[PDB]
Ligand binder design. Structure first.
Ligand SMILES: *[C@@H]1O[C@H](CO)[C@@H](O)[C@H](O)[C@H]1NC(C)=O
Ligand SMILES: *[C@@H]1O[C@H](CO)[C@@H](O)[C@H](O)[C@H]1NC(C)=O
Ligand SMILES: *[C@@H]1O[C@H](CO)[C@@H](O)[C@H](O)[C@H]1NC(C)=O
Ligand SMILES: *[C@@H]1O[C@H](CO)[C@@H](O)[C@H](O)[C@H]1NC(C)=O
Ligand SMILES: *[C@@H]1O[C@H](CO)[C@@H](O)[C@H](O)[C@H]1NC(C)=O
Ligand SMILES: *[C@@H]1O[C@H](CO)[C@@H](O)[C@H](O)[C@H]1NC(C)=O
Lengths: 446, 446, 446
């Protein structure tokens, strides 16, 4: 009933000395200030732990090991030329001549041409449209036919001692045209694995970029460039290539060693981080990713503005006219990748695989082996230094790395902190504060 | 009063069974050893948590995301030649001839010269000092005038589809001479941003290193080297370039793709780590950094030893004579960057921005576009393969990374551990040990 | 005795209101459900912390600083040729001619040879075995003698301003043959240190790959390749080189800048991670490592299958015949590094040092310094662009990095969580549950 009788039986550690059955003394002012000193200091450290919880903190866990049974990625490579010079016919020069800067606006050879005594004559008799009635023309058939063929570029391929074939590369269409992907993982083919590190457990491709098949550059367009070589992108199996933006280049006349390292990044869902479902809802792909978020940007943009998609874009929209490349599709796509700040926002998925790589080159051929490669492939010694290219893609020793975001402070650790801090200063529980509310309920009713 | 009366009311969980109102039995020896067993085991786990706190531990938090509105850094590039050959006059050869290894100690052409039939004759009639009365000469005017000009090297520049100009590069003086910085961020110009990854949201510079303007190398000095190309440093806006030590090189005749990734590093102050104030007190710079700590090393050293500063050093000290470069300033600066172990210690700041990069090259020009660039810039086809250089600097998809050091164990988590460990073994609080001191104060007074 | 008398004195916070000396009311059903509600909710958060402990979790600690007194690593480089052409004698061509694809199976020059009018005549009069009685022949003497000599390749070497010598490189035998290691750390030589970052605190080697000494390639073997240059491996002092698998290449005619960063990786022993003792038991090396685990794989494999070891393999097994290279040792070693999935498993050590590097190249020579290097080394201007090679290996500013795995949840933090969670919900200790077992022991005996 009385406060002296309640504080004797209660489970607060300090109140029994404050409300004892004695007179007022030096003790009752030094027990009360130690109790109110411990009650106020409890509120500072419990506010510190509750406000730390609702920030939802998280730390990282970076394992970097030498894993086995590691899946070899997909390697997409594109020749920097888009079309072979000997495959461009008279019908192809009629429709896509102004796009390739080979004709004027009046279907004739420009006066500012840069060609020798031979390639000018080959272009002058197939740009003769005296009795030319035009035939129909599609761009997808023209990238497929006039592009570079893998049965002529691929001189040798070895993956882990086993010889490749030109039927091991899958034809993919990018902005560079007819491109090829090793270890695409599609068409029912199983995926290839690597066990250890080094050049022996990797890919080795010897190519031929065929500079004699390059069509002459007479202007600055989006289909003719000033360079020679290939561009390579090493990406995951479930990710489409974005090789015009995210690819590295390989020069002819060199053997390029590409030492990779697979880095898997795992994030947290809200309220700790950001996660869209990685096997979520992309419009034309099964696995959501950053590059799959950017391709259906570009597909939705070009269909909205000029009613057509390019040949490297999915969907059922019609392909663009060769005039609609020059007028609509090239400046609208150049607006997205360069000057656009607002149209594309992409939510981060929480399975992102990154391949960090280190490139190095030696010179091919030496003076000793120059005459052997000229006879082996029926070529000249001037051809070999200009065109032959070897690419080595492999993993290092520490080939696997995981960067995982993990929760730093959970609800079971929150109750362990605020249960020890309640017990340290006053020694109470949640059944103590219900015993305080029981005496508060008794003092109102009487 | 009695110990049996005190232990009945006290809040230690074990002492009431030890001092009960009974005879000695098997219980009083098994309650006391469980209490002294829990009292001694409390001291082992509370010592483990207090000694863990005063080590001041910390863990890391590595976020690696694809950020937007990301600020494009500053790009400083220097041609590997210091002076153009057609800008060196007769007065310049008189004073700085022995420095450039073009004259002997008696102001005449050395007998061990390596020049052809034309560049030797051009040097023989401007090294004729028969009636030459010398004029005054400053080195800062000679790096500024005889250095390479950006209105002749810069053939084209594009940043995110927008064309650059030669007025977009800021003249900075380094040890290589007259150098240029894109996106310097100074002079009231706002800083440029990038949104996405890829080559379209980056910089593209086509240069001309001008090997016909290289002055001939006749010896091994600190101003003439054996190489050709440029050196580039990609640094932050608030950081001076140290391009002679920390720059990467770019070769002529190639298109170099530089795929970067911004990495921001945040550390902890003492007693957890090391922090000088990043906007602290550097002698000639506002933001403290590692390179700003090294330049005022080199400025304070050369003024102390030989009373002059070089042209790339701040302050109000006089510039060095061309003899004081050869005698004082070059071996004293070569002592600091190479053989010095004691003069410079730099406290680590805790905002360090690092740009990790991956380089790749294709060949420029191809055989198709060689004749077009020769006519476009009024040059020869031999000139284009030797001198033309294209540089692409861009960000990848995962372009942003934060490595932040965070405290692993604080004072609110320390009281939650030692408050639960006191409560687990004996069930006490800090008001329990004041109840023990109250009975100790009563037993002395009576 | 009674349950009302026991619950009044006990230290469970809720049981005294359940078993009071009153009648049944609304309170006895609301004290019991709050006690059994707090008793059941205690079991959910204590199971969450005990099951979290026995997963043995761990987080990481990534420090990335600019350390001083940092030890410079070992640099192993191998020329891509194995044997000099002018050192192959008539006895050497008799035994190891078919291995080098210079002879048929009947000891004569093949009809499909690729050589000019001079190197064919030099091979035709030393492949004349008309009166040739054969002499004995060992392969270790043939890699040592006919390999490339460092007193002819090394044109200059500087480490931190101090000039190297050819006696500073240690001869190591790899699969490429006679190879050399700078800063090997053996033979009583102290290890070299670096203080700051930049090219001045690093190594600078000017080489001569000697393409006039390359023996002609007439086929595809494991000792003759199509390339020219060197391969370099930057490894630790206590680690053998694996340069045929884990080395990067450097091309002639370029100055390669290699900007490194030392990364030290520390793991945890079981049950938290995986540790073999790093100074454990390798069969032929003192410090256990990944590459030392792979070399005694390859040594144990070849001795088991074809009774001999190659010249780059330790032990006391006999060296292989030049026929046993072609028949046994080359396809058995090509099976291990390429197609083997089961023979080698290597337990991870927990001191792994990794050197992450960034390569960049400028062109050597320029047109100005081409005639000087031709006269300095008594060579032609055609020789200098094909053969001269400069390599710069240095550290960056943030040259040191530590990735340490640290335990996230220990036994002293487990008792602090489950001691606060016991105290928060019921306010009990381990001396409370012994007071419950004391009343359970009393109710059985009476
Ligand atoms: C994401 O990765 C984790 C671990 O690699 C895996 O368990 C999970 O299934 C993945 N989610 C996907 C692929 O949607
Ligand atoms: C080899 O090349 C020549 C010239 O290109 C060609 O005429 C010939 O058909 C090719 N093939 C063979 C087997 O000679
Ligand atoms: C350091 O960085 C943090 C976060 O980037 C920022 O809040 C702080 O103002 C910076 N300190 C400086 C620039 O002195
Ligand atoms: C082009 O180059 C030549 C030779 O270098 C020069 O004489 C001429 O003035 C230049 N300009 C034009 C417009 O021809
Ligand atoms: C492993 O590294 C740690 C820290 O670098 C060191 O203390 C320990 O002695 C090392 N163990 C070895 C070399 O066996
Ligand atoms: C220089 O080279 C030539 C031709 O290789 C040689 O005959 C001569 O001995 C070499 N040395 C000197 C000092 O001329």
């Amino acid at each position: 009933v009385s406060i002296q009788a309640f504080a004797s039986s209660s489970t607060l550690h300090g109140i029994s000395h404050i409300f004892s059955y004695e007179r007022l003394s030096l003790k009752r002012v030094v027990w009360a200030l130690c109790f109110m000193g411990s009650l106020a200091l409890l509120a500072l450290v419990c506010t510190n732990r509750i406000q730390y919880y609702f920030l939802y903190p998280h730390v990282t866990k970076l394992d970097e090991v030498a894993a086995t049974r590691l899946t070899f990625p997909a390697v997409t490579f594109c020749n920097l030329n888009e079309f072979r010079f000997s495959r461009v016919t008279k019908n192809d020069l009629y429709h896509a001549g102004e796009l390739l800067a080979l004709l004027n606006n009046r279907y004739e050879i420009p006066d500012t041409q840069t060609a020798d005594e031979k390639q000018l004559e080959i272009l002058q008799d197939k740009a003769n449209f005296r009795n030319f009635k035009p035939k129909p023309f599609n761009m997808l058939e023209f990238y497929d036919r006039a592009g570079h063929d893998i049965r002529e570029m691929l001189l040798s391929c070895f993956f882990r001692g086993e010889q490749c074939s030109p039927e091991d590369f899958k034809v993919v269409f990018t902005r560079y045209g007819k491109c090829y992907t090793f270890n695409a993982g599609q068409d029912g083919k199983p995926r290839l694995i690597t066990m250890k590190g080094g050049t022996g457990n990797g890919l080795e491709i010897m190519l031929d970029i065929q500079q004699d098949e390059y069509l002459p550059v007479w202007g600055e367009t989006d289909e003719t460039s000033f360079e020679a070589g290939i561009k390579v992108q090493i990406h995951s199996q479930d990710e489409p290539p974005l090789i015009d933006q995210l690819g590295f280049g390989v020069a002819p006349g060199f053997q390029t060693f590409v030492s990779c390292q697979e880095q898997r990044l795992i994030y947290l869902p809200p309220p700790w981080g950001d996660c869209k479902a990685t096997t979520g809802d992309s419009e034309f792909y099964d696995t959501y990713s950053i590059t799959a978020c950017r391709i259906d940007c570009e597909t939705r943009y070009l269909v909205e503005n000029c009613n057509c998609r390019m040949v490297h874009m999915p969907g059922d929209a019609p392909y663009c006219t060769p005039e609609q490349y020059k007028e609509c599709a090239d400046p609208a796509l150049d607006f997205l990748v360069e000057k656009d700040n607002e149209y594309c926002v992409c939510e981060m998925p929480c399975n992102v695989t990154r391949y960090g790589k280190e490139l190095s080159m030696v010179k091919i051929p030496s003076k000793a082996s120059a005459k052997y490669l000229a006879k082996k492939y029926n070529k000249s010694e001037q051809y070999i230094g200009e065109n032959i290219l070897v690419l080595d893609i492999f993993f290092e020793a520490l080939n696997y790395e995981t960067i995982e975001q993990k929760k730093a402070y959970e609800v079971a650790g929150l109750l362990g902190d605020i249960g020890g801090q309640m017990g340290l200063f006053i020694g109470a529980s949640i059944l103590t504060v219900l015993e305080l509310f029981d005496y508060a309920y008794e003092v109102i009713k009487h």
